[PDB]
Design a protein around this nucleic acid. Structure first.
Ligand code: SF4
Ligand SMILES: [Zn+2]
Length: 402
DNA sequence: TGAGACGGGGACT
DNA sequence: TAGTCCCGTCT
């Protein structure tokens, strides 16, 4: 079992927690496009599709970044049938710059499955949503099911994890499988049976605007009377959920002692050489060369200027890049390769350093443009399915140009 | 099982 | 400044 200092053994505490959080939400909730669409869309499938898209985009992405992407998505594909007919290229174009591009592909595949195999009907429970929809894990299933279908299911995102680890003073490593089970148990216990969707959004919004990672706003916290972390700074525990013997306590960290942060290792340094090959084209030039990454691994299926991966001691070499550029353009006068500078793009796991080069041709390449290579205008590149790193490479190529 | 793969940026000091 | 933390799913 566990201690009651770590659970809500008093139903009055749960009832007060629901009413306090919901009351704060009822007078402070942020105006969001997917919240308006949900409360007015009477059709369950349409309503679930709007919630589905928002919850996928919100994965590891802040609300402020999602709002513009969600609006563009719903404008282009207002219905599941519209998304089901879209190409993966189009999805990658709209997802450009949002990050974690597998979310877009699976969102399109899932809608394609709903329309083509389920008659356009969304599963109505978190269990079946998670079972049938790719890219819909445990959070997104409970998110869709509670918000769109009123199923009484609690969810745990990063915000709820931070709120719960503080309210019940959980100081263990939150990523371990046992505290993860206890957090989802607390969420399923606390979720309001009458308003499960509004409860989950209230909990998540509380962790984004009040119970923030740094400098929380307890002077404005509605659940400050049910938080064990807050009362300590002003009932003690009897373990596996408190702070370990090696886990240090800090008087100057306040309630932010919880949750215990996991010191991440800095990303591995990788090095690459990329070049923006240009030709004058006709009207609307110049045209720049884009090639498509493999449909696996990092930035799968996106378009990029021709690049080569180099070991650190070779990061300034040209021979591998020239060999790559001659694949798509044929023979190339090599002394025209101009070094423009470097671009450092940070992934969650890779620190990539691009040595950016530029190559301006006088006319069209003598060899025919092989398949897999496209020559785009500048406007077409800015709307293409490319990663932000390549947009950084282009804007540098645009600066060092006359 | 679980620990790394998988993007980009917003908001703190 | 230039860091530092942090906003799920899958294999
Ligand atoms: S009292 Fe402080 S630590 Fe507790 S939930 Fe509210 S903001 Fe978070
Ligand atoms: Zn304990």
């Amino acid at each position: 079992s566990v201690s009651p200092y770590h659970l809500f053994s008093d139903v009055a505490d749960v009832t007060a927690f629901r009413s306090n959080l919901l009351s704060w939400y009822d007078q402070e909730k942020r105006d969001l496009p997917w919240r308006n669409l949900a409360k007015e869309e009477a059709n369950s499938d349409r309503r679930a599709y709007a919630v589905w898209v928002s919850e996928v985009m919100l994965q590891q992405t802040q609300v402020a970044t999602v709002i513009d992407y969600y609006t563009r998505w719903m404008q282009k594909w207002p219905k599941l049938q519209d998304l089901a007919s879209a190409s993966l290229e189009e999805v990658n174009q709209l997802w450009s710059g949002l990050g974690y591009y597998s979310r877009g592909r699976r969102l399109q595949e899932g809608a394609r499955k709903v329309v083509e195999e389920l008659g356009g009907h969304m599963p109505r429970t978190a269990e079946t949503l998670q079972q049938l929809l790719p890219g819909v894990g445990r959070y997104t299933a409970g998110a869709i099911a509670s918000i769109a279908f009123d199923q009484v299911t609690g969810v745990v995102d990063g915000n709820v994890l931070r709120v719960l680890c503080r309210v019940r003073a959980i100081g263990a490593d939150p990523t371990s499988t046992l505290v993860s089970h206890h957090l989802w148990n607390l969420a399923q216990q606390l979720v309001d049976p009458a308003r499960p969707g509004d409860f989950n959004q209230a909990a998540m919004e509380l962790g984004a605007t009040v119970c923030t990672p740094q400098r929380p706003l307890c002077s404005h916290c509605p659940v400050q009377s049910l938080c064990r972390a807050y009362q300590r700074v002003q009932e003690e525990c009897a373990c596996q959920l408190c702070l370990t013997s090696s886990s240090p306590w800090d008087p100057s960290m306040g309630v932010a002692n919880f949750p215990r942060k996991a010191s991440r290792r800095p990303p591995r340094e990788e090095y690459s050489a990329t070049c923006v090959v240009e030709q004058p084209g006709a009207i609307g030039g110049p045209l720049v060369l884009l090639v498509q990454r493999p449909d696996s691994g990092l930035l799968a299926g996106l378009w990029e200027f021709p690049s080569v991966t180099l070991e650190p001691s070779e990061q300034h070499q040209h021979k591998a890049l020239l060999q790559e550029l001659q694949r798509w353009c044929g023979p190339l006068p090599a002394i025209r390769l101009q070094h423009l500078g470097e671009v450092i793009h940070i992934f969650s796991h890779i620190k990539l350093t691009y040595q950016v080069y530029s190559l301006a041709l006088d006319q069209a390449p003598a060899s025919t443009a092989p398949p897999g290579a496209r020559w785009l205008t500048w406007e077409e590149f800015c709307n293409a399915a490319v990663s932000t790193a390549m947009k950084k490479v282009f804007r540098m190529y645009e600066d060092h140009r006359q």
